[PDB]
Curated annotation (Swiss-Prot), chain A:
Alphabetic keyword roster: Mitochondrion, Ribonucleoprotein, Ribosomal protein, Transit peptide
Species, as recorded: Saccharomyces cerevisiae (strain ATCC 204508 / S288c)
Family, per entry: Belongs to the mitochondrion-specific ribosomal protein mL40 family.
Residues passing through the membrane, by range: none
Included stretch of the parent chain: 34 to 146 of 147
Record keyword Ribosomal protein present: yes
More info: Present with 6300 molecules/cell in log phase SD medium.
Name by which UniProt lists this protein: Large ribosomal subunit protein mL40
Predominant location category: mitochondrion
Entry keyword annotation includes Ribonucleoprotein: yes
One GO term (biological process): mitochondrial translation
Swiss-Prot record, chain B:
Gene source species: Saccharomyces cerevisiae (strain ATCC 204508 / S288c)
Protein name: Large ribosomal subunit protein uL5m
Pfam family, one: Ribosomal_L5_C
A biological-process GO annotation: translation
Single GO term (MF): RNA binding
InterPro entries: Ribosomal_uL5, Ribosomal_uL5_C, Ribosomal_uL5_dom_sf, Ribosomal_uL5_N
Gene designation: MRPL7
Any one of the GO CC terms: cytosolic large ribosomal subunit
Gene3D superfamilies xrefs: 3.30.1440.10
Family in the record: Belongs to the universal ribosomal protein uL5 family.
Swiss-Prot record, chain D:
Native species: Saccharomyces cerevisiae (strain ATCC 204508 / S288c) (Baker's yeast)
Annotated localization: Mitochondrion
Protein name: Large ribosomal subunit protein mL38
Family statement: Belongs to the phosphatidylethanolamine-binding protein family. Mitochondrion-specific ribosomal protein mL38 subfamily.
Functional note: Component of the mitochondrial ribosome (mitoribosome), a dedicated translation machinery responsible for the synthesis of mitochondrial genome-encoded proteins, including at least some of the essential transmembrane subunits of the mitochondrial respiratory chain. The mitoribosomes are attached to the mitochondrial inner membrane and translation products are cotranslationally integrated into the membrane.
Swiss-Prot record, chain E:
Keywords carried by this UniProt record: Mitochondrion, Ribonucleoprotein, Ribosomal protein, Transit peptide
Organism per entry: Saccharomyces cerevisiae (strain ATCC 204508 / S288c) (Baker's yeast)
Protein name: Large ribosomal subunit protein bL31m
Record's subcellular location: Mitochondrion
Residues of the full protein shown: 20 to 134 of 177
Quaternary context: Component of the mitochondrial large ribosomal subunit (mt-LSU). Mature yeast 74S mitochondrial ribosomes consist of a small (37S) and a large (54S) subunit. The 37S small subunit contains a 15S ribosomal RNA (15S mt-rRNA) and 34 different proteins. The 54S large subunit contains a 21S rRNA (21S mt-rRNA) and 46 different proteins.
Any one Gene Ontology BP term: mitochondrial translation
Domain notes: Contains two functional domains. The central domain is sufficient for general mitochondrial translation but not suppression of COX2 mutants. The C-terminus sequence is sufficient for dosage suppression of COX2 mutants.
Signal sequence segment: none
Family: Belongs to the bacterial ribosomal protein bL31 family. Highly divergent.
Any GO CC annotation of this UniProt entry: mitochondrial large ribosomal subunit
Amino acid sequence: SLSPLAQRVVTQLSVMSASRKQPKLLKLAREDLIKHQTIEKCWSIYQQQQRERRNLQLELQYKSIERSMNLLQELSPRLFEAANASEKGKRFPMEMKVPTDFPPNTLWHYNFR
Amino acid sequence: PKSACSLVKPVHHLVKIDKSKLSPRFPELKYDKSDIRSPGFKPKDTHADRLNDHYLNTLQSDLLLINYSHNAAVVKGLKQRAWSGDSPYHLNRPPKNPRGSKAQLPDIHPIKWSNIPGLESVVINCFVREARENQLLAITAALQLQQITGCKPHPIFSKNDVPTWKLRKGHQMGAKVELKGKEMSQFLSTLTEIVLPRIREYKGISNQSGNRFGGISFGLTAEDIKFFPEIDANQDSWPKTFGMHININTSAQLDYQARTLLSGFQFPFFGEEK
Amino acid sequence: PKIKVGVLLSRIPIIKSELNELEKKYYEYQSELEKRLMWTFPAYFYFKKGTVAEHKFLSLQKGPISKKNGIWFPRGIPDIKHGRERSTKQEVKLVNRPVIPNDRITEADRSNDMKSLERQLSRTLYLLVKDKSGTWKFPNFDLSDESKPLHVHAENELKLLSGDQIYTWSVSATPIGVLQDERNRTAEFIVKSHILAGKFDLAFEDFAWLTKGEISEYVPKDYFNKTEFLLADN
Amino acid sequence: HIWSDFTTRPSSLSIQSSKVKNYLFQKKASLDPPSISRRSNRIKYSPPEHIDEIFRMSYDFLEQRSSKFYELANKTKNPLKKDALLIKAEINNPEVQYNFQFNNKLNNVKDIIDYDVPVYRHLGKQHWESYGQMLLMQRLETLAAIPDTLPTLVPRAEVNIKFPFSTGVNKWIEPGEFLSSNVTSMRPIFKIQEYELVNVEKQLYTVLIVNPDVPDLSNDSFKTALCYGLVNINLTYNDNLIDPRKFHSSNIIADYLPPVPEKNAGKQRFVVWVFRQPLIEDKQGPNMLEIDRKELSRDDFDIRQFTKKYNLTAIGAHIWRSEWDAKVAAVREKYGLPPGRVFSRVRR
Amino acid sequence: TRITLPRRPAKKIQLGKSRPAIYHQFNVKMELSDGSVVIRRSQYPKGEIRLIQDQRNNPLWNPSRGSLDRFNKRYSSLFSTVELSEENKKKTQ
RNA sequence: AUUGAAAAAAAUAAUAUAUAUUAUAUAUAUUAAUUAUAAAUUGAAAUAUGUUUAAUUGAAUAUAUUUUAGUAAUAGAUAAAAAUAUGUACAGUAAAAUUGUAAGGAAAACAAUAAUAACUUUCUC
């Protein structure tokens, strides 16, 4: 009927498939449904607020930068030129790592190079 | 059929009739997939995404600061040129195609608080070419992909036909999977930390790699996939293993911006940039 | 007007941000919803039948109550496939060493040492400095030469202050903002830069490494207003 | 805690069921849902875990938001803005959501869903837009009741009709239904549910049922026929069922003549239109209007011309459509209308 | 010639009844090369893993900061730098 | 309905039952199912009845009665790989060329490549 390789392939396929592995549908009572809706809506609102806060902050930073660069242009042309360069190949430093869940054994390195 | 003449009749009102809602056929389908009452419901925002949080906090501001060019105006792309009306044959003529390209190119905007570059989507294209002989290899590749991602893969089929390579048309051959949001972020984090350091002579992603507009890519060999923790934990269960292409799609206007963004997430870049 | 160089050194967080009370609970709920809706664990794949590893897993697990004729099941009749009650959430209990994570709060945090870099791990720390007067501020430096670029000059000044203990990285050549005034006809152009690996430890009397919330307490109100948005909230 | 206060706020914003309210607001998931009436089913049921504390937090968050909105709402002077503020404050209230979703909107009981309350009215409007309004629009366009009678419609009020007096059975007519001559023998009953903010005391309404498809053999075409015409009707958000109780004999500009389609004349559209009166300033009370009853004719009726004359704006519509059956002759006889014509089966 | 698994009749997923594939996933703790632990959701059943070769001990990711084993074992008395200096004359090549 | 936990009711829709009308309506009750379907000397689980250990529950083990395992793809109204070529209903847009990417090369697969003025809703200064 089937080889051992064929069997193993079938098993692998099954791992991915939804055939006889999935539970019943999540039914709720009307009160429960409402509670869920209120949870979700509030959360969504909170997320929107956070986005606006961050977005606003970014806008403020941009405005400050603009204000700075105009001033620099007014005062010292060479300094302005130096500031406003193409940073095409700018690379973030490899020490600035993505913050983990829990910290390492040695928290901070005081010596380098 | 009395005729094939298609011709949509005009209306006498501005109300937008959603025809789906007027039926009683698919009552489960009227609910959005986000809604709890739909069978299509899935808990989306299950836990705090770490890479995304990092981007929000540290990187995004830094990226904005980098990309500020003073009084930078919009750079319009190559577009379809209109004809000068110096002849009456120009009068209903289609426009001249773009200068260099056949297809139109997008406008490059200055980076401000709104349009800072960020990760949009990852796609993991695995086309196993031995599966022209063995269909079961495609299945195994799809499983591997699923294991790696925690996301449902989609089967790739042979779209073309060719004699030199023993390839038919309409044959299942490997799989793909578009990761988005938190799963994608996790996958990137795994790539940065676990897998790519275990590759021996790994210089990084090439600086000559990428789209013209905010898309960067690279690929992993069959040797490299055994470093993924889901595959590594049962090497008996994974005798064969398949390479893959990894298309990273950013919200970057240009490719150097996208490269910079990826560097922020601890991706090394080695080659001479364009 | 005199050109001056402001510098704020940003030590970035080394671990995840702490979740809000609202957030945590919501996330737990979503996890429990996922679990309820999650598929059966396909144990037949990961554990081979008639193997020592499978047996341990089986022992760890406890099975579901099957339907049996002539009995009332007041929580409905058991719906079972691959050995799981479809009507409920499934729980699957699981050098050779237990992975024990380190404490997120630190010794420095406990002591409240403001000069230390390990004192907050989930927040963005900013280098502040106290001058001859009682005021605090971000490191200022006089730019008399004006030959070199501004950010480079700032970095050099920082290095000089340190005695080559610090290891910084400028985010860009562009200045983030300016602090300006009429009494002293000057202009402090603020650069942004990131401490990567070093001490500071040292005209300025004292220094500290603080979050955005603590800087408000230390620094003046007008100054804070001027330079609030530059600092990350977390 | 603004949503627990009912000093200034209406009673309708609360849930009237006590058990349901208790279930909503508890400190642990101990109680069982009032919705599940049966004991065995309650036993079987299991709500999702951790739902209570999070729900409470969400309530607090949205309650705070509502309170903040109210701080603005009371300072506001102009009425539409104030209403909008009120809506914003209370729309995310769980109790009002429960009330609206799970109790009837058509024949709303005032204590549960009060359409005098702005939030509930907004909810009702949204519900109407979701399905019933779209359906009505489709039936107007497909059947060709808009351009044939009255150019366009901008649906504002939800209009539902009924024929209670003829047969006995209770049924709201779905737009574009085929009703028997027995069903539509005696007059219908309207319900004009208004969702916009409008002056309840001043605003009058007119209702016109028009039959565009009565055949005129001189013209070799059709003509309109005003089958039923009411004017100067007073509506209120909750008190809105236009019945012989409400309107007086003075309000009837053309008293109900029934659908009596001729044999082979075809299917006849009867499309009720609901207009609101023009509102005059510097005049307290409801501004009436006089109709020249000799000028307007029933056997031929320019609806558009009539509208132009009295400066009406069509807010709502509904439509049924009748064709010939055996009982139309009986209906004619009852009403004292003539025998009724019979046309050739072929449209030659 | 072409090795395949021949398809059975497909099961009709009705419109609206399609359910999203929520695979069974465990919360897995990865301790990296150093003691930094990170939680990640994973399909394989293992609550804890500790990694040997990661970015946190690779030189590319931090520039600023068993044949060999067998050999070491069975040439241990000799103790095999000084040895390199002794046995590295760079004239002949 | 009995069982668990610590007077009632007021939508839609479905189901059950009843009746109203030359009206596929209304009334009351209740919220099921939702990816399954025969056949397994062998795997796994439960319950019942025994026996031994620390009246007791856990733990171990025997028999009986069941339940699961036949492990197989679409999870989306799918949308230019291949497959039902006539009906109807609903919805969408192709191709080329270009820039890239593990074996991949001119030629296998995947990604990306025209413009947002005005409008509606949401959050926010």
